[PDB]
Design an enzyme around this catalytic site. Structure first.
Site, PDB file in Angstrom:
ATOM      1  N   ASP A 114       0.812  -1.204   0.000  1.00 43.48           N
ATOM      2  CA  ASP A 114       0.000   0.000   0.000  1.00 43.48           C
ATOM      3  C   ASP A 114       0.851   1.263   0.000  1.00 43.48           C
ATOM      4  O   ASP A 114       1.361   1.728   1.046  1.00 43.48           O
ATOM      5  CB  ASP A 114      -1.011  -0.043   1.161  1.00 43.48           C
ATOM      6  CG  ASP A 114      -1.931   1.119   1.154  1.00 43.48           C
ATOM      7  OD1 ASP A 114      -1.941   1.929   0.203  1.00 43.48           O
ATOM      8  OD2 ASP A 114      -2.643   1.260   2.135  1.00 43.48           O
ATOM      9  N   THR A 115       1.029   1.844  -1.189  1.00 47.47           N
ATOM     10  CA  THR A 115       1.808   3.038  -1.293  1.00 47.47           C
ATOM     11  C   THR A 115       1.110   4.288  -0.695  1.00 47.47           C
ATOM     12  O   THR A 115       1.755   5.316  -0.517  1.00 47.47           O
ATOM     13  CB  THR A 115       2.202   3.347  -2.781  1.00 47.47           C
ATOM     14  OG1 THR A 115       0.969   3.485  -3.533  1.00 47.47           O
ATOM     15  CG2 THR A 115       3.137   2.275  -3.292  1.00 47.47           C
ATOM     16  N   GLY A 116      -0.177   4.210  -0.400  1.00 48.53           N
ATOM     17  CA  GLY A 116      -0.883   5.298   0.258  1.00 48.53           C
ATOM     18  C   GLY A 116      -0.958   5.201   1.786  1.00 48.53           C
ATOM     19  O   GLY A 116      -1.806   5.880   2.422  1.00 48.53           O
TER      20      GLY A 116
HETATM   21  C1  3TL Z   1      -0.816   8.421   8.311  1.00 49.95           C
HETATM   22  C2  3TL Z   1      -1.699   8.482   7.094  1.00 49.95           C
HETATM   23  N1  3TL Z   1      -2.297   9.541   6.698  1.00 49.95           N
HETATM   24  C3  3TL Z   1      -2.142  10.847   7.051  1.00 49.95           C
HETATM   25  O1  3TL Z   1      -1.440  11.657   6.451  1.00 49.95           O
HETATM   26  O2  3TL Z   1      -2.760  11.370   8.127  1.00 49.95           O
HETATM   27  C4  3TL Z   1      -3.168  12.770   8.107  1.00 49.95           C
HETATM   28  C5  3TL Z   1      -4.666  12.969   8.036  1.00 49.95           C
HETATM   29  C6  3TL Z   1      -5.562  11.931   8.262  1.00 49.95           C
HETATM   30  C7  3TL Z   1      -6.943  12.113   8.189  1.00 49.95           C
HETATM   31  C8  3TL Z   1      -7.459  13.371   7.894  1.00 49.95           C
HETATM   32  C9  3TL Z   1      -6.563  14.421   7.668  1.00 49.95           C
HETATM   33  C10 3TL Z   1      -5.188  14.223   7.733  1.00 49.95           C
HETATM   34  C11 3TL Z   1      -1.815   7.168   6.377  1.00 49.95           C
HETATM   35  O3  3TL Z   1      -0.658   6.667   5.974  1.00 49.95           O
HETATM   36  N2  3TL Z   1      -2.956   6.617   6.313  1.00 49.95           N
HETATM   37  C12 3TL Z   1      -3.269   5.302   5.726  1.00 49.95           C
HETATM   38  C13 3TL Z   1      -4.502   5.451   4.846  1.00 49.95           C
HETATM   39  O4  3TL Z   1      -5.747   5.326   5.284  1.00 49.95           O
HETATM   40  N3  3TL Z   1      -4.349   5.671   3.588  1.00 49.95           N
HETATM   41  C14 3TL Z   1      -5.557   5.938   2.767  1.00 49.95           C
HETATM   42  C15 3TL Z   1      -5.352   7.190   1.900  1.00 49.95           C
HETATM   43  C16 3TL Z   1      -5.185   8.328   2.860  1.00 49.95           C
HETATM   44  C17 3TL Z   1      -3.940   8.949   2.993  1.00 49.95           C
HETATM   45  C18 3TL Z   1      -3.852   9.979   3.923  1.00 49.95           C
HETATM   46  C19 3TL Z   1      -4.984  10.330   4.667  1.00 49.95           C
HETATM   47  C20 3TL Z   1      -6.204   9.693   4.535  1.00 49.95           C
HETATM   48  C21 3TL Z   1      -6.310   8.663   3.608  1.00 49.95           C
HETATM   49  C22 3TL Z   1      -5.345   4.885   1.722  1.00 49.95           C
HETATM   50  O5  3TL Z   1      -5.330   5.381   0.627  1.00 49.95           O
HETATM   51  C23 3TL Z   1      -5.109   3.422   1.914  1.00 49.95           C
HETATM   52  O6  3TL Z   1      -4.367   3.030   0.740  1.00 49.95           O
HETATM   53  C24 3TL Z   1      -6.343   2.702   2.369  1.00 49.95           C
HETATM   54  C25 3TL Z   1      -5.965   1.357   2.940  1.00 49.95           C
HETATM   55  C26 3TL Z   1      -7.095   0.414   3.183  1.00 49.95           C
HETATM   56  C27 3TL Z   1      -7.368  -0.551   2.215  1.00 49.95           C
HETATM   57  C28 3TL Z   1      -8.441  -1.381   2.523  1.00 49.95           C
HETATM   58  C29 3TL Z   1      -9.179  -1.282   3.698  1.00 49.95           C
HETATM   59  C30 3TL Z   1      -8.895  -0.307   4.653  1.00 49.95           C
HETATM   60  C31 3TL Z   1      -7.835   0.522   4.354  1.00 49.95           C
HETATM   61  N4  3TL Z   1      -7.213   2.689   1.197  1.00 49.95           N
HETATM   62  C32 3TL Z   1      -8.434   3.047   1.248  1.00 49.95           C
HETATM   63  O7  3TL Z   1      -9.018   3.418   2.375  1.00 49.95           O
HETATM   64  C33 3TL Z   1      -9.332   3.075   0.002  1.00 49.95           C
HETATM   65  N5  3TL Z   1     -10.493   2.253   0.284  1.00 49.95           N
HETATM   66  C34 3TL Z   1     -10.777   1.354  -0.611  1.00 49.95           C
HETATM   67  O8  3TL Z   1     -10.002   1.126  -1.675  1.00 49.95           O
HETATM   68  C35 3TL Z   1     -11.948   0.469  -0.458  1.00 49.95           C
HETATM   69  C36 3TL Z   1     -13.117   0.349  -1.409  1.00 49.95           C
HETATM   70  N6  3TL Z   1     -11.843  -0.209   0.608  1.00 49.95           N
HETATM   71  C37 3TL Z   1     -12.392  -1.167   1.354  1.00 49.95           C
HETATM   72  O9  3TL Z   1     -12.357  -2.325   0.992  1.00 49.95           O
HETATM   73  O10 3TL Z   1     -12.964  -0.897   2.545  1.00 49.95           O
HETATM   74  C38 3TL Z   1     -13.260  -2.005   3.441  1.00 49.95           C
HETATM   75  C39 3TL Z   1     -13.666  -1.710   4.861  1.00 49.95           C
HETATM   76  C40 3TL Z   1     -14.085  -2.744   5.680  1.00 49.95           C
HETATM   77  C41 3TL Z   1     -14.426  -2.450   6.983  1.00 49.95           C
HETATM   78  C42 3TL Z   1     -14.401  -1.147   7.483  1.00 49.95           C
HETATM   79  C43 3TL Z   1     -14.004  -0.123   6.656  1.00 49.95           C
HETATM   80  C44 3TL Z   1     -13.631  -0.423   5.363  1.00 49.95           C
HETATM   81  C45 3TL Z   1      -9.767   4.461  -0.412  1.00 49.95           C
HETATM   82  C46 3TL Z   1      -8.550   5.356  -0.602  1.00 49.95           C
HETATM   83  C47 3TL Z   1     -10.733   4.506  -1.606  1.00 49.95           C
HETATM   84  C48 3TL Z   1      -3.302   4.165   6.768  1.00 49.95           C
HETATM   85  C49 3TL Z   1      -3.849   2.829   6.271  1.00 49.95           C
HETATM   86  C50 3TL Z   1      -1.999   3.966   7.554  1.00 49.95           C
END
Ligand code: 3TL
Ligand code: 4DX
Ligand code: K
Ligand code: K
Lengths: 99, 99
Positions: A25-27
């Protein structure tokens, strides 16, 4: 390996002798694992994602193998739905994005 | 290009005639951008992540330039803190993870 993005980039990892599936996960700044038992003391950390913030346990200097490559670093554990390998460990394994 | 992961993989995009900064995100199934109007009709969608679910607006057949590479696909619009380029568009630019 070269991993294309047509499907989620899910790979086998191993931690404490246990094989798990995780998302490259690059994000994600950090690596966050589903609930499980790790060794040593932890410290508190809050991480933010799409839906808001959660509290997680931070463990340091933890051994993890990712598709065979050993990494040793910070691992967060808590209520994430999917094991997520973040940039902290992708860097150790020499992972890059290329186009 | 080759994008290392010591820092967040942020790139310039163009969409709806606007330049934005977005994160190249292998852990996102879908592309999700901050609030904007886009051409065409939309429909509601829920997406989930760390912290739960947010309601977004889905637009189809949206043109986008990622780092000067054209792609077309679905783009979701809503209260995301960071613009996120998901796998649905990373595939079109030929994006892969390599280690
Ligand atoms: C520290 C940090 N971010 C950061 O800078 O913090 C500052 C901040 C935060 C919030 C508000 C303001 C400022 C970070 O690295 N965050 C990650 C993160 O959530 N990263 C998300 C992007 C992001 C970046 C910065 C701030 C906020 C969001 C993703 O893109 C990351 O790649 C996630 C990982 C993930 C994958 C699957 C499940 C849960 C999490 N993808 C996503 O959340 C994507 N969702 C999805 O692709 C779908 C459809 N997911 C899914 O399957 O959801 C299932 C689910 C099941 C049960 C409960 C909830 C969800 C989204 C970008 C569209 C974390 C996993 C450590
Ligand atoms: C058509 C739209 C996406 C490609 C680059 C220009 C514009 O913003
Ligand atoms: K490539
Ligand atoms: K590499």
């Amino acid at each position: 390996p070269q991993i294309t993005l047509w499907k989620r980039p899910l790979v086998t990892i191993k931690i404490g002798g246990q094989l798990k599936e995780a998302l490259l996960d690059t994000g994600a700044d950090d690596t966050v694992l589903e609930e499980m038992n790790l060794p040593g003391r932890w410290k508190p950390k809050m991480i933010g994602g799409i839906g808001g913030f959660i509290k997680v346990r931070q463990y340091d200097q933890i051994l993890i193998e990712i598709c065979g490559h050993k990494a040793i670093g910070t691992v967060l554990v808590g209520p994430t739905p999917v094991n997520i390998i973040g940039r902290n460990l992708l860097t150790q394994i020499g992972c890059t994005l290329n186009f």
